[PDB]
Amino acid sequence: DGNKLDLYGKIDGLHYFSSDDSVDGDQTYMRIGVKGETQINDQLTGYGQWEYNVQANNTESSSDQAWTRLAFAGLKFGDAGSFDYGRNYGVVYDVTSWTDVLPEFGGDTYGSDNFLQSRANGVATYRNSDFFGLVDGLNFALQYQGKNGSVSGEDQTNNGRDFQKQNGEGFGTSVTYDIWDGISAGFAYSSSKRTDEQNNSTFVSKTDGGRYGVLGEGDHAETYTGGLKYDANNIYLATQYTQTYNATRTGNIGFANKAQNFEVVAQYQFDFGLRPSVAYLQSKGKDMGRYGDQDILKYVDLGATYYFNKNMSTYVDYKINLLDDNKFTKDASISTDNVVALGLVYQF
Amino acid sequence: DGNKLDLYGKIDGLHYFSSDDSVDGDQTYMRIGVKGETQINDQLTGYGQWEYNVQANNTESSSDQAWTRLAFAGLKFGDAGSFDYGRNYGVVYDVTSWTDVLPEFGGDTYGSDNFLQSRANGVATYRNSDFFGLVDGLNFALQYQGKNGSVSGEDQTNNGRDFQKQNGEGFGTSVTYDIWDGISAGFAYSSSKRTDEQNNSTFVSKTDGGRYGVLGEGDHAETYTGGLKYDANNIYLATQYTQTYNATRTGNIGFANKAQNFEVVAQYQFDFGLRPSVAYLQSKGKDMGRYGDQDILKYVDLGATYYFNKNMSTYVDYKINLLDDNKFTKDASISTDNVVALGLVYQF
Amino acid sequence: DGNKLDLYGKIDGLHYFSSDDSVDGDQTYMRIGVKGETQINDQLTGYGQWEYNVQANNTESSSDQAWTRLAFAGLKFGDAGSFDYGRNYGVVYDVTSWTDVLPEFGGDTYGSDNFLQSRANGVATYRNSDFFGLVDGLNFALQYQGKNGSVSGEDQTNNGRDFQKQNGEGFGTSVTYDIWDGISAGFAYSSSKRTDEQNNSTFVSKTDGGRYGVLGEGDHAETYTGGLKYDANNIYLATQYTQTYNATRTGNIGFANKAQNFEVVAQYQFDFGLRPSVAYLQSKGKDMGRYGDQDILKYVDLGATYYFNKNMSTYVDYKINLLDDNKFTKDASISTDNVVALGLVYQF
């Protein structure tokens, strides 16, 4: 009485084929989660959602095989909008998600716990749908994120973390709009203080051998995003453009002083199950101290998903990695090899 | 047919505000668990319960984010009582729980895996309700706990653990009684052997710099508890008094040779959702070698919970920490700062 | 509509009694899992299964307390057979499982992540039931396993692991057949390349103090298995014989150049719940370099299970360990002490 509660998840039998040893092999994993709603009164509704990743590709004595992707509780007051708090998606992703639809790859001009660009600890999000019911299809969002800092130091918080996934106080906003038939447009902005260890950490160069500062200096990390989306007539066309400031990771050795990020995807849905997909993603870093302008990410993606029904599917995906081995990709530990994925997935 | 089985849990979007860096920030977490019953025959019933904590306030590459709070299987033979085994609550908590009702704080003159004072590995518990159906409201309990020891040494067990959470063989008993209207009284006693590493470990002083024995010497660890509870007329009044012997932790540097523990709470339930709450907790350690008598814990707590319904609530809680920085709180790593909590929680 | 989905698991309140400190004490744990089916069309069916182990015998600050036992997605095309991929049982276990029916012990002439002998990462399995519906009771299986390698080195994969649980490319096949009344016969074969760290790792001798190669040299690891099973008239008789080549572990210091493995079990099911059980298991290693022929495993097992119903049971099991302390069992860290188990288990 009153409460709805759904168990959901999937089991993904997955194998990667690649020349990069740290990528190649068995990638089997599963997801399980919970979605809940309670109607409090005719205007007010409470909700909660949890989503868990459980790796299955290592042993029963291996370590760190599970993690939480989402955990948030929330309130939705009809026409006034909604508010939720917890681990949830940064609002930049309200736009960039429109290109995150590849069978297995994609969605990686950005990472998780990467300021407000994806999933994020301690994020307070306000959302409004049809501009208070006055403008159908015109959604916007306002978000706040507290500092998630180091385990020690001046910038310690209880939930410490290495410098690549720390953040200071920040906010972000997003707007999406539906234009006539299926065509949607979106903008998103975010801004965060950085942390001492982000500005004061060093790293040791796989090429020279010497020690240097972690790429990126700055008091602030920033993203600007614009996106377009065609969805109708069994066509899916989408693109997104994002420009960032000390916000985009350069492998594991820091951030890019400036980076320009671009993703474009085209897909077609046959009504006998098959869903082919073509995509291009790049990330171009600027003024990265001793590395100057370099590609951070650059590939073409080709793949397809076969849907047996809403509970079962198979997919192949082929990442054609147009990066070259150099001192930047080596010193930053960015993979320059191709990958093939092959998946058979049960959903529930 | 025959079996009942309930999924239960909650998602708790929670943030702490504090000057103590190791406490402050995002504290989002979730609980999920299972409660089960099977009727074997008209007298005999089997049951099982599991309860899991999943942290959500750190990253997807962080470690140790989940843990089990309860896991026990059991048998209940009508009027003869019940028996269960596994990870479950030490019976001291049958009384001290009556003060563990604060919105977020409280319940911490004692810890988990802290002999029979709270949740505990390998605990065999016998419970009897209305004294075999002869005295309505008069419950008692008998409990046994095997040694949970070190990872190495003379006192090794399979499930080793640091000295602050080891225990030797022990037992405990508890009695509660309902007096007329809502007024309940309770007593509880426990006794355990200690372990070699508890008596033979050293620690390094954050103030002097030198090495010393871990506070507390003794073959035995002991607790005596008395408690009172008023529940009726939308009032909740409760208090509990506990005296311990090498059983109460002194931060992370050992145990208190003697400690006197006191908790008192008053709450009021308005029938429009709001539930204000006032509380006082102290822990006073005695004869702690080079530290003598010191406060181990001392605060006032002020907070409130708003229940939208049985599935949704919001709460604020304010811990006013009356401890002062000194060599004891510093050398033992006890927090002396205030904390505010702010939570929005979905239950299912 | 279309999808079946079952939550399943058990809570096992369990205690071990033993002179081996690393074995003795509380062993409480739980299992939880998911089994799913979707009918795609009248011939074709998709399925998925996940099964999770959650330890409960250590603290809430302990590490590595959970792990995945099974995670696989699959397809079943009526008379043509089935195919599944993920973490699943190596097909050798299609036969050796017939002796894995002891109340608590047994099933340990082999381990998990032990080539195709038990549960295994990245295993692709084809199964066929009544030989395409032509021969009732005659099942066979074909299986493939990709390399699961080191975290570094020439044999790195993404899901690295210590040498005792690495494997190279391998395959395995199995056949079972039902003979008239309850009597079944089975054969199974497997073959895998080994890995550099399996052939190139050293270890330090608990008896001498000096360094030596990890037992077992060889390009290939191999198993041959035959098994018999009587099931009917409330009798359970089963035996299995397996001969292995650099495939059977010698504690933690390597593999046995050759090992001959034997298990035999007899049980009786009274229809008032009780199920007594008697068993013998040995593992005899050959030509193990400086250790020559030694017993790797040798015990008698005596125990019983009481079933209150399909959801509740109690069991005792007594492992009489006929191994002697020597340089082999010490240098390999194999336990030579007896064990008693005592369990009360709730299933759902």
Describe this structure in words.
The structure is a homotrimer. The first copy, chain A, is mainly β. In chain A, about 5% of the residues lie in helices and about 55% in strands. In chain A, the strands form two sheets. The first copy, chain A, has a 16-stranded antiparallel beta barrel. The longest helix of chain A has 6 residues, at about 325-330. The interface between A and B is large, with 47 and 39 residues.
Summarize the structure.
By secondary structure, the first copy, chain A, is mostly beta strands. In chain A, 4% of the residues lie in helices and 54% in strands. The radius of gyration of chain A is 21 Å and the shape is globular.
Question: What is the third-level CATH name, the topology of chain A?
Answer: Porin
Termini Cα gap of chain A = 23 Å
What's the helical proportion of residues of chain A?
A: under 10%
What strand line-up does the widest sheet of chain A have?
A: 1-3-4-5-6-7-8-9-10-13-14-15-16-17-18-19
- Which oligomeric state applies? homotrimer
What is the C-level CATH assignment of chain A?
Answer: Mainly Beta
State the domain count of chain A: 1
Task: Give the number of DSSP strands of chain A.
Answer: 19
Major protein interface: A-B, 47 and 39 residues
CATH architecture of chain A: Beta Barrel
Q: What is the N-to-C order of secondary-structure elements of chain A (H for helix, E for strand)?
A: EEEEEEHEEEEHEEEEEEEEHE
Main sheet attributes: strand count, strand direction, barrel closure of chain A? 16 strands, antiparallel, barrel
Main location (chains A, B, C): membrane
GO biological process, one term (chains A, B, C): monoatomic ion transmembrane transport
Pfam family, one (chains A, B, C): Porin_1
Subunit structure (chains A, B, C): Homotrimer.
